[PDB]
Amino acid sequence: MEQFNAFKSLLKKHYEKTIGFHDKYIKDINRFVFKNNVLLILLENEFARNSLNDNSEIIHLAESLYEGIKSVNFVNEQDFFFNLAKLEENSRDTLYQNSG
């Protein structure tokens, strides 16, 4: 819900000047997930990924929306896929209700 808007908008303040970069790759993706103290985000561009991982620390800000992020990383559509593929046969086996 507001989460993405919270963590993401947080970046804005950070990259409130690195426009060109945005208009470059980060543009407007749509593949990112959280569910292991870690966060993964789509990023095939070799360069964009080079620099980003060379010195980014997306935790330096994302450590406000959550208790305390552990880290952040970006990869390619294929690699990223391997991250969610890890899950075996089981998955959302949890069964709750908005009225416990």
Swiss-Prot record:
Q: Coiled-coil stretches, from where to where? A: none
Residue ranges, annotated region (Domain II): 72-99
What's the domain of life for this entry?
Answer: Bacteria
Renumbered to this chain, region (Domain I, interacts with DnaA modulators) spans 1-72
Q: Which residues cross the membrane?
A: none
- Cellular location of this protein? Cytoplasm
As for family, the record states: Belongs to the DnaA family.
Quote the entry's note on domains: Domain I is involved in oligomerization and binding regulators, domain II is flexibile and of varying length in different bacteria, domain III forms the AAA+ region, while domain IV binds dsDNA.
Quaternary assembly: Oligomerizes as a right-handed, spiral filament on DNA at oriC.
Q: What does this protein do?
A: Plays an essential role in the initiation and regulation of chromosomal replication. ATP-DnaA binds to the origin of replication (oriC) to initiate formation of the DNA replication initiation complex once per cell cycle. Binds the DnaA box (a 9 base pair repeat at the origin) and separates the double-stranded (ds)DNA. Forms a right-handed helical filament on oriC DNA; dsDNA binds to the exterior of the filament while single-stranded (ss)DNA is stabiized in the filament's interior.
- Official protein name in the record: Chromosomal replication initiator protein DnaA
Species this chain originates from: Mycoplasma genitalium (strain ATCC 33530 / DSM 19775 / NCTC 10195 / G37) (Mycoplasmoides genitalium)
Taxonomy, top ranks, is: Bacteria, Bacillati, Mycoplasmatota, Mycoplasmoidales, Mycoplasmoidaceae
